[PDB]
């Protein structure tokens, strides 16, 4: 019958669809890898600041995540979260920057809770290089630094990192893009 030809076409179309997602996913997966780091330092590049800022305001997209980064080849898996329009006490007024601990595939061998010092910062692209940053020492009793249970733990950082004005007036933005850098202390910890 022709119902056979059409069924076969349908089968193919269905699979071609799947293949497309599989492909798209891998493009994403490539990207993540190509930008991975294993020395506990993250350099997160955020293009389209205007549009993304606007989507934060419009409530379309409140926050953004960096690709994951590591303290070592088989160490903690972490990342960053930013709210272009602020969160909490900085909401609407500042840019909030947080640190996140993700469920690593080797947590069973890592020390908990997380105790490595974290240094959050936004880079200045102007030639005077007056970067903005602040560091902290994980709070042992905080549920953000315990052995992950779900994919990610509660983000912990600075809700009032930078005043949105300061950000948008200084030389931090250039070519509609900003750079965020995280520095996790690794030296102080028995390495593999």
């Amino acid at each position: 019958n022709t119902g056979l030809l059409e069924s076969q076409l349908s089968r193919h179309d269905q699979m071609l669809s799947v293949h497309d997602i599989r492909l798209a996913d891998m493009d994403l997966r490539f990207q993540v890898l190509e930008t991975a780091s294993y020395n506990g330092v993250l350099i997160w590049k955020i293009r389209d600041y205007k549009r993304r800022k606007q989507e934060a305001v419009m409530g379309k997209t409140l926050s953004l995540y960096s690709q994951p980064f590591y303290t070592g080849y088989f160490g903690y898996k972490m990342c960053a979260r930013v709210y272009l329009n602020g969160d909490g006490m900085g909401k609407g007024t500042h840019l909030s920057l947080f640190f996140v601990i993700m469920r690593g595939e080797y947590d069973a061998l890592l020390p908990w809770p997380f105790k490595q010092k974290v240094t959050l910062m936004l880079m200045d692209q102007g030639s005077s290089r007056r970067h903005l940053g602040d560091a902290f020492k994980p709070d042992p009793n905080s549920s953000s630094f315990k052995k992950p249970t779900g994919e990610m733990n509660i983000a912990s950082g600075c809700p009032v990192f930078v005043a949105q004005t300061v950000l948008e007036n200084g030389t931090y933005i250039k070519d509609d893009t900003i750079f965020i850098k995280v520095i996790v202390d690794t030296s102080d910890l028995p390495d593999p």
Binding site: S156, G157, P159
Partner: peptide, 7 residues
């Protein structure tokens, strides 16, 4: 170290 709203 301050935490983010639940979301």
């Amino acid at each position: 170290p301050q935490q983010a709203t639940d979301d």
